[PDB]
Design a protein around this nucleic acid. Structure first.
Ligand code: GDP
Ligand code: ALF
Ligand code: MG
Lengths: 450, 125
RNA sequence: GGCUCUGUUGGUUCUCCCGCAACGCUACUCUGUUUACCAGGUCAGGUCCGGAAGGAAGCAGCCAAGGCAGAUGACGCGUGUGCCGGGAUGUAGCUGGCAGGGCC
RNA sequence: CGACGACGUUGAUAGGCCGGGUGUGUAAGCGCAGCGAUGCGUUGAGCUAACCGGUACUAAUGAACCGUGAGGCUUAACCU
């Protein structure tokens, strides 16, 4: 729907100009409504729209085929850039034990996240993990975390509803430091931003254990309240990251964009399922790619774009390799054009001042020499041509054995090619008239031939 | 006795220094990356960057002021129409210093020094 | 007015076997490019033998092929789905019905 | 100079950046007054090195290298 709406909008409003702010109105409105149906926070929607405007002012769109497609490309790039980077991971470098604190609303899946991160850090990172339940409120929450910990093979710290979260996490931290645990996972009760006592509680806990990692667990189906929750939780605690859960649903998941924008904290994890063994890393491009459904439209476009890309790549590379300078390719061309057009008898006539000093019969026969040169060049691979400085003795052996001649002749032609390269380089650096007039006839004295 | 003393002499008299940093600053701003000795370039930090902090607030006063720092109109107009917007959201640290091999002639330690966004705005253009 | 446990029976879980239907996984190969002479084929050009007829060693290019990647079918390893599927087995564990006692 | 002291991202070691302090002494622009120099208002203004308090924005790199693997003989005094 996005591509269709944008293409339709850019087509119906303006013809082919260079896109201007006046043409992006209905575009921005349709994108706005698209994000509103995506359950994205309205202020985030507006602040994104502003960036879309800033990118719309300078559009290079006119030179392409489909304006809506490249506009979609720009929006996707900006959105991915807004989602942050990849390979985001908790800091297990930390001085052990590493303390990870959980925060979020009720039924956010914080406990299941503790189980997932438990199995993940235990198996993959080879870490010794201790888990503890700070929840004295929710019935059988401690038993749940204990069960999950028993399933993932992670040691569990005993706790009950008769205790207090502070003493619980303090005893857990003490036990973690005493038994030399690598990672301390702290699960806490789901709480509302409108609750003062619970916020003071999680603040006292965060102050008590001083966690190196504070994770914010929010549902993917969360609505406009995600703004309030993200803001309040961000102002209450110095979040080190955000953990999104229930991404496997059909939900739009604009709440991720909301929290990411408002808090400014990166998303390090995406729950892909209910089970403990199911966890996925956060990929900005994957999340920013899909809120939609469609078919058969994007395939042809992606194909054509690929064709244009590979064509422009090959055509630019072909000019780039030939634009490096003078090589054995151009030398080969000049040599075949030589042997075809060879003017030795005529060039002896064309030259006047050089014939008065040098011998008249000193001119070598073009046919034999240039056939030898052509054939010897034909014994060379394309790499030794474009890059002549990689030629060594063994390659000279291959060449000489291939053409059925002596290596000294190969060295001779490499010398002549060196001379030609130097000369043509001097022609490229200076003027052809300054360089043609700079040509000098060397005489070692005023005596002829001495 | 050098105690708590800041600034580096670099074997020049006062005015000479001052000038050298004006042209070095100018040159950097113009090309966005240069190659100089290490210590000259650690002293350049303390010149160029406050210029940038100046350009992050636009007024006639600051235009003039930075002109009196660098003595060039090309450099100031660039400073305010480009680098002012660019670093607008960043706190200090506008330059990065990368040490390299040694000046072959005298065996001096060399460093490229550059604006942090030298790369991405040279790519995106 | 509730509950527990025996007699009988219906389910369910675990262990073993199997059918139908409904969701998900490696190693090889097809394309993208790569590897100078020292694996191979065609081997232009040139070169070797011959008056000629023609053969020959073999460079480059190309194709296997050998590196590195984008995914194609069958093997290999799994399952909170449905037919309350069909069976085997527990001296088992859990649950319900009925014949009920007894405890309050 | 070697040397000693602090630190090297789990980081305030250095510069920057934010705040203060200090110093100088009321920036520039604009408005008003005057024929003009200059004055008056915006204004204790503007700038401020080396100082103090914060802040990882830039640089302090994953590594590698040196260093090893139970430590001589004799005698005595306890211990098997
Ligand atoms: N599909 C899916 N379900 C999830 C995920 N995380 C949690 N849940 C569900 O959340 C339910 C219990 O949430 P819970 O962890 O107890 O809430 P919390 O302890 O307050 O964070 C479980 O039944 C899970 O099925 C997830 O990433 N994906
Ligand atoms: F349901 Al919760 F913390 F486990 F709110
Ligand atoms: Mg919980």
């Amino acid at each position: 729907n996005l591509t269709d709406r944008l293409s339709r909008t850019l087509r119906n409003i303006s013809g082919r100009g260079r896109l201007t702010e006046d043409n992006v109105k209905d575009t921005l409105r349709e994108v706005r409504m698209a994000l509103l149906e995506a359950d994205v926070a309205l202020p985030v929607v507006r602040e994104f729209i502003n960036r879309v405007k800033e990118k719309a002012v300078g559009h290079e769109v006119n030179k392409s085929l489909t304006p809506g497609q490249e506009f979609v490309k720009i929006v996707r790039n900006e959105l991915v850039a807004a989602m942050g980077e990849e390979n985001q991971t908790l800091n297990l470098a930390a001085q052990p034990p590493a303390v990870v604190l959980m925060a979020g609303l009720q039924g956010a899946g914080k406990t299941t996240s503790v189980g997932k991160l438990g199995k993940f850090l235990r198996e993959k990172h080879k870490k010794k993990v201790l888990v503890v339940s700070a929840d004295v409120y929710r019935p059988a929450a401690i038993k749940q975390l204990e069960t999950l910990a028993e399933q993932v093979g992670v040691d569990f710290f005993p706790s009950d509803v008769g205790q207090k979260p502070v003493d619980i996490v303090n005893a857990a931290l003490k036990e973690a430091k005493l038994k030399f645990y690598d990672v301390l996972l702290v699960d806490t009760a789901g709480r509302l931003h409108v609750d003062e006592a619970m916020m003071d509680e999680i603040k006292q806990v965060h102050a008590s254990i001083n966690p190196v990692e504070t994770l914010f667990v929010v549902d993917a189906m969360t609505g406009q309240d995600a703004a309030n929750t993200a803001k309040a939780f961000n102002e209450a605690l110095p979040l080190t990251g955000v953990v999104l859960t229930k991404v496997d649903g059909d939900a739009r998941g604009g709440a991720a964009l909301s929290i990411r924008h408002i808090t400014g904290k990166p998303i390090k994890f995406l729950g892909v399922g209910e089970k403990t063994e199911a966890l996925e890393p956060f990929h900005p491009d994957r999340i920013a790619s899909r809120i939609l459904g469609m078919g058969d439209v994007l395939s042809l476009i992606e194909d054509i774009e690929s064709k244009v890309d590979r064509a422009q790549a090959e055509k630019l590379a072909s000019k780039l390799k030939k634009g490096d300078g003078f090589d054995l390719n151009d030398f080969l061309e000049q040599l075949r054009q030589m042997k075809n057009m060879g003017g030795x008898x005529x060039x002896x006539x064309x030259x006047x001042x050089x014939x008065x000093x040098x011998x008249x019969x000193x001119x070598x026969x073009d046919d034999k020499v240039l056939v030898r040169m052509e054939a010897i060049i034909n014994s060379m691979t394309m790499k030794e041509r474009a890059k002549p400085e990689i030629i060594k003795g063994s390659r000279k052996r291959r060449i000489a054995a291939g053409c059925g001649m002596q290596v000294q002749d190969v060295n001779r032609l490499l010398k002549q090619f060196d001379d030609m390269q130097r000369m043509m380089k001097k022609m490229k650096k200076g003027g052809x008239x300054x360089x043609x007039x700079x040509x000098x006839x060397x005489x070692x004295x005023x005596x002829x031939x001495x | 006795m050098r105690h708590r003393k800041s600034g580096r002499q670099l074997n020049r008299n006062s005015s000479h220094r001052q000038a050298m940093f004006r042209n070095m600053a100018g040159s950097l701003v113009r090309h966005e990356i240069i190659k100089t000795t290490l210590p000259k370039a650690k002293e350049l930090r303390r010149v160029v960057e406050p210029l940038i902090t100046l350009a992050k607030t636009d007024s006639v006063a600051n235009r003039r002021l930075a002109f009196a720092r660098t003595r060039d109109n090309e450099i100031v107009a660039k400073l305010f129409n480009e680098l002012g917007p660019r670093f607008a959201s960043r706190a200090g640290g506008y330059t990065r210093i990368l040490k390299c091999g040694f000046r072959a002639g005298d065996n001096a330690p060399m460093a490229y020094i550059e604006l942090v966004d030298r790369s991405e705005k040279a790519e995106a253009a």
